Coordinates of C-alpha atoms in Angstrom, one line a residue:
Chain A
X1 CA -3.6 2.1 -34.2
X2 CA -5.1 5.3 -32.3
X3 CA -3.3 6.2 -28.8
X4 CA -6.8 6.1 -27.2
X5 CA -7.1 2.9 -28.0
X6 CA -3.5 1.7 -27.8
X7 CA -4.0 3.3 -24.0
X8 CA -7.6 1.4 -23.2
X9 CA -5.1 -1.6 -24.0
X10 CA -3.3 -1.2 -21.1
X11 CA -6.3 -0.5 -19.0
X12 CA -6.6 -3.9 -20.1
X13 CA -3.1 -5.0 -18.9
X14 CA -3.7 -3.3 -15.7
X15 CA -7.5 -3.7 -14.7
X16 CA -6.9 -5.0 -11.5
X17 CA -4.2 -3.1 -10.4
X18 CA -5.1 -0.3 -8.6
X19 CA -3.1 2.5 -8.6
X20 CA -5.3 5.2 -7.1
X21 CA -7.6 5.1 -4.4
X22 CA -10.5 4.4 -6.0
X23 CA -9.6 2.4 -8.5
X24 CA -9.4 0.4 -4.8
X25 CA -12.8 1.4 -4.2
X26 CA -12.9 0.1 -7.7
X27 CA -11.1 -3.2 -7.6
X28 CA -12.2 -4.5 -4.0
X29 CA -15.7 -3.6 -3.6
X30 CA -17.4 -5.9 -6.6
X31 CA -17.2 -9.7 -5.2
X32 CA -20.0 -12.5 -4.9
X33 CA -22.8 -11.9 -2.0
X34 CA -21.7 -8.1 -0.4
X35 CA -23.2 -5.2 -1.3
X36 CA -20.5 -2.7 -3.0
X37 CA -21.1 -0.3 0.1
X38 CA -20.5 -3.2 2.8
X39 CA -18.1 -5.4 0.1
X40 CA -16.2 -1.5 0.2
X41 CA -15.2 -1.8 3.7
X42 CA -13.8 -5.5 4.7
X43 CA -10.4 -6.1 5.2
X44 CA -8.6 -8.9 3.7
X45 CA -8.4 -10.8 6.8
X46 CA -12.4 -11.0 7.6
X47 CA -12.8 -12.3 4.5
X48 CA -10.1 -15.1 4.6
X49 CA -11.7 -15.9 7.6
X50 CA -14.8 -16.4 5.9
X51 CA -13.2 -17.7 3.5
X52 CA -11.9 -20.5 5.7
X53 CA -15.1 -20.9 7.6
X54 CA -16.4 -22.1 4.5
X55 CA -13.2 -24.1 3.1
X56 CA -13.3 -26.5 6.2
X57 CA -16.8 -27.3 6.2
X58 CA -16.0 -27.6 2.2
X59 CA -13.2 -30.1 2.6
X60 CA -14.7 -32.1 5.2
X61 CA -17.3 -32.7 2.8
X62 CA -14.7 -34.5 0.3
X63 CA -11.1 -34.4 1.2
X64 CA -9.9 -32.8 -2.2
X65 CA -10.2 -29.0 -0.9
X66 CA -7.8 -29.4 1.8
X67 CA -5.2 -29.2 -0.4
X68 CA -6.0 -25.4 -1.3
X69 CA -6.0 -24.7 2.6
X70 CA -1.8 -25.8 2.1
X71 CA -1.2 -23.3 -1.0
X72 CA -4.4 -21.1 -1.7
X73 CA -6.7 -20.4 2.0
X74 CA -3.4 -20.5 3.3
X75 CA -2.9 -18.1 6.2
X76 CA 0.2 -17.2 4.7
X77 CA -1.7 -16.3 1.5
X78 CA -3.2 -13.5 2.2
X79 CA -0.8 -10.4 1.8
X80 CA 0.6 -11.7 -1.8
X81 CA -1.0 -10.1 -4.5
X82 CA -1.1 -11.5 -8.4
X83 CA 0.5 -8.7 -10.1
X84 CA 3.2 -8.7 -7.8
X85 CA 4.4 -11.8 -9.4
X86 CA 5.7 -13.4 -12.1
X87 CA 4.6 -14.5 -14.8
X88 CA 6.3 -18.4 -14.2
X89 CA 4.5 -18.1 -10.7
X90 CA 1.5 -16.5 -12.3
X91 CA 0.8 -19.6 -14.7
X92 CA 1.1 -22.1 -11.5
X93 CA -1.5 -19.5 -9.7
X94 CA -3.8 -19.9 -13.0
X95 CA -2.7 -23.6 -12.4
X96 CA -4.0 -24.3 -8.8
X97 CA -7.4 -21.7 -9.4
X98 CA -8.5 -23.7 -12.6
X99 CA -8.4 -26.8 -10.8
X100 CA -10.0 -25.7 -8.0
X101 CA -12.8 -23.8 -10.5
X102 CA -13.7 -27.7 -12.0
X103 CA -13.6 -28.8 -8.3
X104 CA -16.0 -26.5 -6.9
X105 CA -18.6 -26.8 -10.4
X106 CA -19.7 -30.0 -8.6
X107 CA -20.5 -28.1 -5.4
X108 CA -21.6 -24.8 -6.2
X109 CA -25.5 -25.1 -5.1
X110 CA -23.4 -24.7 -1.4
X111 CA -23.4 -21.5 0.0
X112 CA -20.0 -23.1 1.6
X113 CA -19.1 -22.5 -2.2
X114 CA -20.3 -19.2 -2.7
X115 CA -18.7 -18.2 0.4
X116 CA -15.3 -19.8 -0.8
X117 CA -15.0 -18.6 -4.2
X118 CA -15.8 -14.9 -3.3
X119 CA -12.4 -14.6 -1.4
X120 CA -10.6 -16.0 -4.3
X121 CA -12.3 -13.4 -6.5
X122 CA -11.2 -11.0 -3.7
X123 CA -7.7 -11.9 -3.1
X124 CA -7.2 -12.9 -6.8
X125 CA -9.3 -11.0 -9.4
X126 CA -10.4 -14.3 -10.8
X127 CA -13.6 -12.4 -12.0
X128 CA -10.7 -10.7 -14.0
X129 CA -7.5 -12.3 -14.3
X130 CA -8.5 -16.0 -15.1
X131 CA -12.4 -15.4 -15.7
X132 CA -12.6 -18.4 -19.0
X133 CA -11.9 -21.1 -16.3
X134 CA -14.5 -18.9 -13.9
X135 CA -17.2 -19.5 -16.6
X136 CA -16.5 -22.3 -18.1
X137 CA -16.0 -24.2 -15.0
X138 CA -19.6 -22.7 -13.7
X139 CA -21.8 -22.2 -17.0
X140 CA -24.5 -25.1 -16.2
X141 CA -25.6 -22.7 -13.4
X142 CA -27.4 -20.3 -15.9
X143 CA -30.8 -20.0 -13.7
X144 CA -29.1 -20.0 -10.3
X145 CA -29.0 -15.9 -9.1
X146 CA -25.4 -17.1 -7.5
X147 CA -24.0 -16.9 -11.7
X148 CA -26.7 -14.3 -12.5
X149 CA -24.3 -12.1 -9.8
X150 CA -21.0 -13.9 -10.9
X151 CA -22.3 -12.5 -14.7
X152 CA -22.4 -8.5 -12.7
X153 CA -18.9 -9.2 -11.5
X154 CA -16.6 -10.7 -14.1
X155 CA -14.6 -9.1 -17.0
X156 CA -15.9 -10.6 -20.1
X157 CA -14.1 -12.1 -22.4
X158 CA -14.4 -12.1 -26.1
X159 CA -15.4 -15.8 -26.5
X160 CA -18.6 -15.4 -24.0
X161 CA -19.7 -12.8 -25.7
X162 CA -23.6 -13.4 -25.7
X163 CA -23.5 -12.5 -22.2
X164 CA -23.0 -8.6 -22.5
X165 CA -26.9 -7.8 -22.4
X166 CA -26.8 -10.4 -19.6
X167 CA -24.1 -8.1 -16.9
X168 CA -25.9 -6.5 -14.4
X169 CA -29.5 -7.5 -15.5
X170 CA -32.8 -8.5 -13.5
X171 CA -34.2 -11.7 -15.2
X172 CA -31.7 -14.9 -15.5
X173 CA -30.2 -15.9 -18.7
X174 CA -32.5 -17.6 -20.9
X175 CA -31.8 -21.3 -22.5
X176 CA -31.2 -19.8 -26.0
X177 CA -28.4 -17.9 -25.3
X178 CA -26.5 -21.2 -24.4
X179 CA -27.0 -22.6 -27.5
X180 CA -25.9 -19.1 -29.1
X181 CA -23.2 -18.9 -26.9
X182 CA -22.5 -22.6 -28.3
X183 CA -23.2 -22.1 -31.4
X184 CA -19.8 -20.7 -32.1
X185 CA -17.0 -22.5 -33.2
X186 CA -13.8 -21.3 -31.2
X187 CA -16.3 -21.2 -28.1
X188 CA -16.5 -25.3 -28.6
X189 CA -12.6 -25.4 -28.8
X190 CA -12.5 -23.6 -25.3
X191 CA -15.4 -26.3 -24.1
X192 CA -13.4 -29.3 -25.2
X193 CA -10.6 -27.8 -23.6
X194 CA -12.8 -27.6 -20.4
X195 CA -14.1 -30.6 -20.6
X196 CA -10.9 -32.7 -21.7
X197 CA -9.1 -30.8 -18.5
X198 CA -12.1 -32.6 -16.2
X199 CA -11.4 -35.7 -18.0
X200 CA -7.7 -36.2 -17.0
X201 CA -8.6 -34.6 -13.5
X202 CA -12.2 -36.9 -13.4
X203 CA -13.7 -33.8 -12.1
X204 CA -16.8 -34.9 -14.0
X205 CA -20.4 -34.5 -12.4
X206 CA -23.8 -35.6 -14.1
X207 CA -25.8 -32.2 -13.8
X208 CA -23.1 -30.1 -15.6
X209 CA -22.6 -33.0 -17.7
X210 CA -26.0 -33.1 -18.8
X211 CA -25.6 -29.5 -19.5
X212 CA -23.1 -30.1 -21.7
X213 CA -24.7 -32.5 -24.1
X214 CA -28.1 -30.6 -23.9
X215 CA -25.6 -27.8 -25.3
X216 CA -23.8 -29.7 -28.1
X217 CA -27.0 -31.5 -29.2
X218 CA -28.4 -28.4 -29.6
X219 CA -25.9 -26.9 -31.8
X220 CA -25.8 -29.9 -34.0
X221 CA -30.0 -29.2 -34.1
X222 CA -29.1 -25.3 -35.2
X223 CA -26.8 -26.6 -37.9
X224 CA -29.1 -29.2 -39.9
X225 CA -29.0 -26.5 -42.6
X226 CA -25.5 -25.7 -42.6
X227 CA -23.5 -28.9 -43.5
X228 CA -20.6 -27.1 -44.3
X229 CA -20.4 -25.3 -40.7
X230 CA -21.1 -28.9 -39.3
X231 CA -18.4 -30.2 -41.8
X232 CA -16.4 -28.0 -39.6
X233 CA -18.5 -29.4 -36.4
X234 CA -17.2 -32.9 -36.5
X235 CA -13.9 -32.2 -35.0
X236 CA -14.7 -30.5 -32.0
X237 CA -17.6 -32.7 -31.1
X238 CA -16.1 -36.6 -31.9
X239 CA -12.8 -35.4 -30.3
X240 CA -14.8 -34.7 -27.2
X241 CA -17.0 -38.1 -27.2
X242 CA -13.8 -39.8 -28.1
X243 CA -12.2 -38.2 -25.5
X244 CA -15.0 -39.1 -23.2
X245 CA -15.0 -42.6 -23.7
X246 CA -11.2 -42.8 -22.5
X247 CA -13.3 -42.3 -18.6
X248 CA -14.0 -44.7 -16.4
X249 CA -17.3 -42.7 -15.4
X250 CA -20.3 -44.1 -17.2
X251 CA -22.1 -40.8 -17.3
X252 CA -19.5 -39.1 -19.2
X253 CA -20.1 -42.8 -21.0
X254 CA -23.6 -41.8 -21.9
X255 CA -22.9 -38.4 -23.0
X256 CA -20.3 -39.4 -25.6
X257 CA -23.4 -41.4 -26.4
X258 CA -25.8 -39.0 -26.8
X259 CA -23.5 -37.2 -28.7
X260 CA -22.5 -39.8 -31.4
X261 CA -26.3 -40.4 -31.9
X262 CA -27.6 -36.9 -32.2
X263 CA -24.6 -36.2 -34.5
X264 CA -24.9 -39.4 -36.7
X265 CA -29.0 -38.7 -36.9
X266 CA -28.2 -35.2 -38.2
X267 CA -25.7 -35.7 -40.2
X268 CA -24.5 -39.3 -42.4
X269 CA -21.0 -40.0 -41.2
X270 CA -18.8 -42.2 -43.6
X271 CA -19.7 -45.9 -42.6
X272 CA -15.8 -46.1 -41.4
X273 CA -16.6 -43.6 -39.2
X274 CA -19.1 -45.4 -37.6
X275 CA -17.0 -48.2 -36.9
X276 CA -14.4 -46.2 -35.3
X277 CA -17.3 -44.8 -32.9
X278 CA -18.1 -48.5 -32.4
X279 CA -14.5 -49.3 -31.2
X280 CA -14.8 -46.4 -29.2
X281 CA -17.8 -47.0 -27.6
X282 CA -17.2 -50.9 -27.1
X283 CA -14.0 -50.2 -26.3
X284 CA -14.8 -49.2 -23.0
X285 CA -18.1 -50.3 -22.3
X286 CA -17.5 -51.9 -19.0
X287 CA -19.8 -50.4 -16.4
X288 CA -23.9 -52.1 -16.6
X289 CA -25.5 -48.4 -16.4
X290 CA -23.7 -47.4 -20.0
X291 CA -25.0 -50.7 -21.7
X292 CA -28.7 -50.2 -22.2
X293 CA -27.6 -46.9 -23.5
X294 CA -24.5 -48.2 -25.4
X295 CA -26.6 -50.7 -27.6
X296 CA -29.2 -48.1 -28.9
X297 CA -26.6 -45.9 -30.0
X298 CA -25.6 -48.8 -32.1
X299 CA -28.8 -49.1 -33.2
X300 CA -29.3 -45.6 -34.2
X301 CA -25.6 -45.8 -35.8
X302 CA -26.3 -48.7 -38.1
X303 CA -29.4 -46.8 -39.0
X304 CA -27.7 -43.4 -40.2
X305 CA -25.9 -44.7 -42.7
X306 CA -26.7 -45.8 -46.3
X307 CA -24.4 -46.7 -49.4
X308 CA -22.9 -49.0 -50.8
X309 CA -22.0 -51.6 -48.4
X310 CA -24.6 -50.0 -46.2
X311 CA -25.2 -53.3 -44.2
X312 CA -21.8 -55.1 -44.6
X313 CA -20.1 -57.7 -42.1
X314 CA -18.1 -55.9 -39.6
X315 CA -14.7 -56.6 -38.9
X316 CA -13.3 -59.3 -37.3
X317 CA -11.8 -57.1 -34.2
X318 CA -14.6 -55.4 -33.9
X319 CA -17.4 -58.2 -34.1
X320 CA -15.3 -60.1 -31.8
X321 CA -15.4 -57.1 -29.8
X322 CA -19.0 -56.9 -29.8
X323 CA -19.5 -60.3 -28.7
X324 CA -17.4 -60.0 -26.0
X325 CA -18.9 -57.0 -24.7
X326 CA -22.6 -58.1 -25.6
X327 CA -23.7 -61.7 -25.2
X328 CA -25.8 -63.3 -28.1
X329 CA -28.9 -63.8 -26.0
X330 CA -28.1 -59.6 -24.7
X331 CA -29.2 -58.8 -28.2
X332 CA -31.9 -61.9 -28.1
X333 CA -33.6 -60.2 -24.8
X334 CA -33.0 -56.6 -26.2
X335 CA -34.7 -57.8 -29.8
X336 CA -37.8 -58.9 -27.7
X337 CA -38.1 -55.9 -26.0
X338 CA -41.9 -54.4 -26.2
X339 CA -40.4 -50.8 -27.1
X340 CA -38.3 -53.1 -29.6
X341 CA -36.7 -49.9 -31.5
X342 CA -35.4 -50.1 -35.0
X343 CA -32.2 -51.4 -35.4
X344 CA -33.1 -52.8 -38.2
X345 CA -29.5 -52.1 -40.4
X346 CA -27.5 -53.3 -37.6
X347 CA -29.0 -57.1 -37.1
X348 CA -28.8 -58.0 -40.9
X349 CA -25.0 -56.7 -40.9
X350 CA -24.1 -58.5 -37.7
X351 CA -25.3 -61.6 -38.4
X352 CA -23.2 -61.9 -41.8
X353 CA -20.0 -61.0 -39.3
X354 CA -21.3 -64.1 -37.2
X355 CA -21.8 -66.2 -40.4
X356 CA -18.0 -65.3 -41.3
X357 CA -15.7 -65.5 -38.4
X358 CA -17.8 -67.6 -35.7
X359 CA -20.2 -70.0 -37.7
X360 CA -20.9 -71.9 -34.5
X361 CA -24.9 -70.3 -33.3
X362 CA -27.0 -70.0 -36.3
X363 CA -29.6 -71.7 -34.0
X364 CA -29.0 -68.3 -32.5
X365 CA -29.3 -66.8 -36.4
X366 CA -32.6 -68.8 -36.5
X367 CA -34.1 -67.1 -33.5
X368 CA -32.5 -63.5 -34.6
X369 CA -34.3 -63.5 -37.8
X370 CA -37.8 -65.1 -36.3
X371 CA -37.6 -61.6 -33.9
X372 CA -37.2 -58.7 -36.6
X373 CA -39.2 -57.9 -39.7
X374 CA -35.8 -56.6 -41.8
X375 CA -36.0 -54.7 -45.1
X376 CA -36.5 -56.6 -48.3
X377 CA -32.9 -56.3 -49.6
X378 CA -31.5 -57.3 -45.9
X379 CA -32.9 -60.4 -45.7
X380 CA -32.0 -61.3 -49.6
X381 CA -28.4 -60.3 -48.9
X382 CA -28.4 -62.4 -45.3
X383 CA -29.8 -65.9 -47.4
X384 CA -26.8 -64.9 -50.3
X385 CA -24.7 -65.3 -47.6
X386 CA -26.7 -68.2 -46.6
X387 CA -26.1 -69.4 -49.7
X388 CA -22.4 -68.9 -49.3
X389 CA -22.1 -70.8 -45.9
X390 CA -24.6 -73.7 -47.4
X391 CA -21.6 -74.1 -50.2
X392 CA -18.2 -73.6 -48.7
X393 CA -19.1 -74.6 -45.1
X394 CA -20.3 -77.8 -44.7
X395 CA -23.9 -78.2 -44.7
X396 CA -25.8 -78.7 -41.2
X397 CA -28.8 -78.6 -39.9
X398 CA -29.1 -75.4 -38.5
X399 CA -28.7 -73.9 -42.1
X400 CA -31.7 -76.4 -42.9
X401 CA -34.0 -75.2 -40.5
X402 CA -32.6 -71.5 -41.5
X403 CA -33.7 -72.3 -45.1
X404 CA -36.8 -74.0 -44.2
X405 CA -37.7 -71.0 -42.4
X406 CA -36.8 -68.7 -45.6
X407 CA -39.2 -71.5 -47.3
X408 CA -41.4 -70.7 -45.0
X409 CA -41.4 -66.9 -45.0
X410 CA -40.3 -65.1 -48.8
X411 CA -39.7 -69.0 -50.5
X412 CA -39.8 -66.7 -54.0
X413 CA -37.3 -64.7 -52.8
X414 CA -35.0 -67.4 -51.9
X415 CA -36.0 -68.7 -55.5
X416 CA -34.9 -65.5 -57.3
X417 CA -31.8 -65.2 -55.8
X418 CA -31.3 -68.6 -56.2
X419 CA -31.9 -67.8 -59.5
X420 CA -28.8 -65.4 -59.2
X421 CA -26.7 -67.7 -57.9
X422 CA -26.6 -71.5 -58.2
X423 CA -29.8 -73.6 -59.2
X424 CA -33.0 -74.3 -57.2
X425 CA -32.6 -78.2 -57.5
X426 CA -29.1 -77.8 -56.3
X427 CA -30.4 -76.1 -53.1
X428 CA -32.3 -79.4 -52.7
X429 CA -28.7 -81.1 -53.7
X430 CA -27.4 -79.2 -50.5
X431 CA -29.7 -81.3 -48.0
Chain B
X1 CA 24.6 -23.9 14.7
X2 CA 21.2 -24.7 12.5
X3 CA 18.2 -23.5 12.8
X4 CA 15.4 -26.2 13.5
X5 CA 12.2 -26.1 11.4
X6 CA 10.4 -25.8 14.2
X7 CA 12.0 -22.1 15.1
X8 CA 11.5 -21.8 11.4
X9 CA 8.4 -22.7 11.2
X10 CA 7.6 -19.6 12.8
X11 CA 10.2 -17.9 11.0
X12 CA 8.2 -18.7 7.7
X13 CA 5.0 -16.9 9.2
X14 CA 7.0 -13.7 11.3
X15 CA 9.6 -13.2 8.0
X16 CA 6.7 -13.3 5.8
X17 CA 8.1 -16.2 3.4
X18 CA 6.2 -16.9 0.7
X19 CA 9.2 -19.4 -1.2
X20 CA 7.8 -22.3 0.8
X21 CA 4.0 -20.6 -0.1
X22 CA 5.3 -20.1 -3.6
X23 CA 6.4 -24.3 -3.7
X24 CA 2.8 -25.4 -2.5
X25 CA 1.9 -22.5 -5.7
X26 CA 3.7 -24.5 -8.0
X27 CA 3.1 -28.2 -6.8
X28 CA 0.2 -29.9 -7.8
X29 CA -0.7 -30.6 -11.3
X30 CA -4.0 -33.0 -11.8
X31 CA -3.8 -34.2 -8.7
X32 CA -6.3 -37.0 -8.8
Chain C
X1 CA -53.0 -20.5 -22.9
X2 CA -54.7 -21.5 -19.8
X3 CA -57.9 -20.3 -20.3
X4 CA -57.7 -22.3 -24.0
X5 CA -56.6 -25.3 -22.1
X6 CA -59.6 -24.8 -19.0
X7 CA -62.2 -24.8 -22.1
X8 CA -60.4 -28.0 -23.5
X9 CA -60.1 -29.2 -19.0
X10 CA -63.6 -27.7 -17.6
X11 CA -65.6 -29.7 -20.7
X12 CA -63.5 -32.8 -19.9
X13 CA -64.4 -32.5 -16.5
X14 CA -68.3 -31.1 -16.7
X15 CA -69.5 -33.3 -19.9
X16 CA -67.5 -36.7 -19.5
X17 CA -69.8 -39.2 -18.2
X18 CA -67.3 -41.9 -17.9
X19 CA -64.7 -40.3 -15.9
X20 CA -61.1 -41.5 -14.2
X21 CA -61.9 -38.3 -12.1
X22 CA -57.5 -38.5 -12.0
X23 CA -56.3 -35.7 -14.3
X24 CA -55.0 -36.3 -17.1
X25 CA -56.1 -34.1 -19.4
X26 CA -55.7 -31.5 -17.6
X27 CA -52.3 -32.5 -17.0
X28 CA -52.1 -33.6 -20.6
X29 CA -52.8 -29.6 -21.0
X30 CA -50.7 -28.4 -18.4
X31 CA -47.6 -30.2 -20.1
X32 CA -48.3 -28.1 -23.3
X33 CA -48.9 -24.8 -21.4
X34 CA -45.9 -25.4 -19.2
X35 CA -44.2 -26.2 -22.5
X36 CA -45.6 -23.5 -24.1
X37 CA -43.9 -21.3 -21.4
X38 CA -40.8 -22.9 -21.3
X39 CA -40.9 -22.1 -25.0
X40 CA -41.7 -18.5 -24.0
X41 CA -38.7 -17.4 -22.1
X42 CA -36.6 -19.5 -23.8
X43 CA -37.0 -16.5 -26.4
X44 CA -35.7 -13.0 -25.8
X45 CA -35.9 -9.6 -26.9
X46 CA -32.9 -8.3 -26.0
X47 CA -29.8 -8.2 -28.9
X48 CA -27.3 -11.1 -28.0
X49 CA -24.4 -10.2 -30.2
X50 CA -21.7 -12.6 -32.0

């Protein structure tokens, strides 16, 4: 390397520890609401003061901020600096500010928040020292001035790097440079890494939630050219919906949802795929909010797949599965629905897994296939089936008013394939 | 002849002890 | 934008002789303007880098 540049690397190791006077002047006067001439001249007590001032009205709105008045707005911790420590006791620093950073996302339209924070980017650098938990723990707040001064303030790292037109501008950043800022790869690894941390933690509110969906839908809409980039894609986004299922919270529930449909409408997943987002999503469907969502995902699943096999039975754990978390007549009120959306691939695949395993409700077949107007080969492929259970099962008269109703509607169809397989006369042999 | 923690409890703010500060530091992982 | 949409708005409102007098169109305009606009500064001219 140069020694210019192998020196700027240790401004780097030591950008908040100031040595001279001004670098003081430097180091104390940038924090969140005081002008630098006014933020120049306070003392580390008025601002812990503050900074308490807003911490109690902060944790008597939900008790999980007192614990930072025991280690963090401590009045014991005020003199202790970062760099004075080590690195062991550095990490368990980084360790109690991170988790309060995902605490305080929920609650940063407070100016109790604003008023918090700032000490801890005074008495710890945090704008500096740990500044990928202080923006990734507050990057839904794009519009809000509050970030647009945070942006003026903090260090930026490498991986937000769409941001450096952005420090110490006039207008707010705009919605396109989130979806740049997302559009990178190793940016997603360090938002799964945020958003698996909130998981574990269940520090997981809906409006940065929402954010984050709007923000991964989006870069699966900027890479509907580049298959290859999303082949590269799927990890980092079905690691994060799988890993949001695991919550109890049904609108992290939705947003793995939203995620597995905007991904499986913009790009085909292998069908096994989609069963493994099915276990997923079944799995732990348990809440009523998630359900109405839940079963149009399926819908659009089933629908975003074609080969061969394209509307197979399902397994046995997972149809059962289904049925335990769905009712029949669930799917016999959703089918009559007046917005009655396509989920036309799933029906004629489900019914097959009924017409294996269960056997017991093809009165409930009967109305299934009265709802829907399926695709030509679909209803062929149920009435081979048909076929199949009027043979090996024994006949009954639930398969005769099935077949009378496939008399009824497509009689030459039933005739061709019966041309396939078996005889026509024999059909009438069967009842 | 002990101390109490009491007479150390304001030993750990005049002395300016940080080692129980540094504990509460270094307690709490996922706390919820 | 606007003054397109209050040529497609005023006309609704001054030649419409059956009427819901309840604004729809012209908030069946202001949608697309206000979409329009949330279209506009979702663009920038600045250089956001890589």
């Amino acid at each position: 390397s140069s020694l210019s540049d192998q020196l700027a690397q240790v401004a780097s190791n030591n950008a908040t520890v100031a040595l001279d006077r001004k670098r003081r002047q430097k180091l104390h006067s940038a924090s969140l609401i005081y002008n630098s001439k006014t933020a120049a001249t306070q003392d580390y007590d008025f601002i812990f003061e503050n900074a308490s001032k807003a911490l109690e009205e902060l944790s008597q709105i939900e008790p999980k901020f007192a614990i930072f008045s025991r280690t963090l707005f401590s009045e014991s911790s005020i003199s202790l600096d970062r760099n004075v420590q080590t690195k062991e006791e550095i990490k368990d620093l980084d360790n109690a500010i991170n988790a309060y950073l995902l605490l305080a996302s929920s609650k940063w339209y407070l100016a109790p928040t604003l008023h918090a924070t700032e000490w801890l980017v005074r008495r710890f650098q945090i704008h500096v020292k740990n500044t990928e938990m202080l923006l990734l723990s507050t990057l839904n707040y794009y519009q809000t001035p509050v970030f647009k001064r945070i942006l003026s303030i903090i260090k930026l790292p490498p991986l937000f790097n769409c941001l450096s037109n952005f420090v110490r501008s006039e207008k707010p950043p705009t919605a396109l440079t989130m979806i740049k800022l997302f559009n990178d790869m190793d940016f997603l690894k360090l938002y799964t890494s945020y958003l698996d941390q909130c998981i574990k933690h269940n520090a997981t509110y809906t409006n940065q939630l929402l954010f984050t969906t709007c923000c991964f839908i989006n870069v699966v809409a900027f890479n509907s050219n580049n298959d290859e980039k999303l082949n590269q894609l799927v990890p980092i986004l079905l690691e994060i919906s799988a890993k949001l299922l695991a919550s109890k919270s049904k609108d992290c529930q939705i947003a793995a949802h939203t995620i597995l449909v905007v991904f499986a409408t913009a790009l085909p997943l292998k069908k096994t795929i989609i069963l493994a987002a099915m276990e997923t999503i079944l799995s732990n469907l348990d809440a009523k909010e998630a359900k109405h969502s839940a079963l149009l995902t399926i819908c659009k699943l089933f629908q975003t797949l074609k080969g061969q096999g394209n509307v197979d039975q399902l397994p046995s754990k997972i149809f059962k599965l289904f049925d335990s978390k769905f009712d029949t007549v669930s799917i016999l009120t959703f089918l009559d629905k007046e917005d009655k959306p396509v989920c036309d691939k799933f029906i004629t695949s489900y019914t097959r897994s009924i017409a294996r395993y269960d056997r017991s409700k093809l009165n409930i077949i009967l109305s299934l296939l009265k709802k829907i107007r399926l695709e030509r080969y679909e209803v062929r492929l149920i009435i081979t089936d048909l076929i199949y259970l009027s043979e090996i099962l024994e006949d009954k008269s639930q398969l005769v008013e099935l077949f009378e109703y496939f008399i009824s509607i497509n009689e030459d169809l039933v005739l061709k394939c019966l041309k396939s397989l078996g005889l026509t006369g024999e059909l009438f042999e069967i009842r | 002849p002990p101390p109490d923690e009491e007479e150390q409890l304001l030993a750990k703010f005049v002395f300016g002890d940080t080692t129980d500060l540094q504990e509460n530091l270094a307690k709490f992982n996922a706390d919820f | 934008v606007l003054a397109a949409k209050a040529a497609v708005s005023l006309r609704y409102d001054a030649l419409a002789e059956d009427r819901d007098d309840s604004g729809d169109i012209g908030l069946e305009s202001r949608a697309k303007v206000e979409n329009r606009l949330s279209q506009l500064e979702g663009r920038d001219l600045r250089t956001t880098p890589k």
